[PDB]
Amino acid sequence: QSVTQPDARVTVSEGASLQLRCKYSYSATPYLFWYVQYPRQGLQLLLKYYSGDPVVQGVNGFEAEFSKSNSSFHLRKASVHWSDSAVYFCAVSGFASALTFGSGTKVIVLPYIQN
């Protein structure tokens, strides 16, 4: 139905937290998703919410919470890895609805360098 990703880009150092904002529009029961696009590959599903517990855990430390009250589906990760650089897309759906995508959010991760 409708999804909004208010930030187009995010720059962050390896080790720090990350929050990618997503707002949705619907009235019914929404099906929510996060997809990730790594360089030189197609979209992949990162996490999804259909029902039950609003906090959903996806691959590699990624988390998202469905909030009906706040009508949000913010994605978070406690400590980002350098390989997390990518474009993240929020999408929404429903019982008799098509899948709709947001404009996406580019995440640039600065790698941590030691000696």
Ligand X SMILES: *[C@@H]1O[C@H](CO)[C@@H](O)[C@H](O)[C@H]1NC(C)=O
The contact pattern for ligand X, residues 28-67, with x = CB under 6 A and - = no contact, is -------------------------------------x-x
* Complex with ligand X: residue 34 or 85, whichever CB lies closer: 34
SS3 (DSSP) at 79? coil
**Residue from 1, 4, 37, 72 in contact with ligand X (CB under 6 A):** 72
- Shortest distance, CB of residue 72 to ligand X, whole angstroms? 5
> Residue 81 phi/psi, 5° resolution?
-100, 155
- Shortest distance, CB of residue 49 to ligand X, whole angstroms? 13
**Residue from 70, 79, 83, 103 in contact with ligand X (CB under 6 A):** 70
Task: Give the whole-angstrom CA distance, residue 105 versus residue 10.
Answer: 7
27 CB-contact burial (10 Å; exposed 0-12 / middle 13-18 / buried 19+): exposed
Task: Give the whole-angstrom CA distance, residue 12 versus residue 17.
Answer: 8
Q: Give residues in contact with ligand X (CB under 6 A).
A: 65, 67, 70, 72
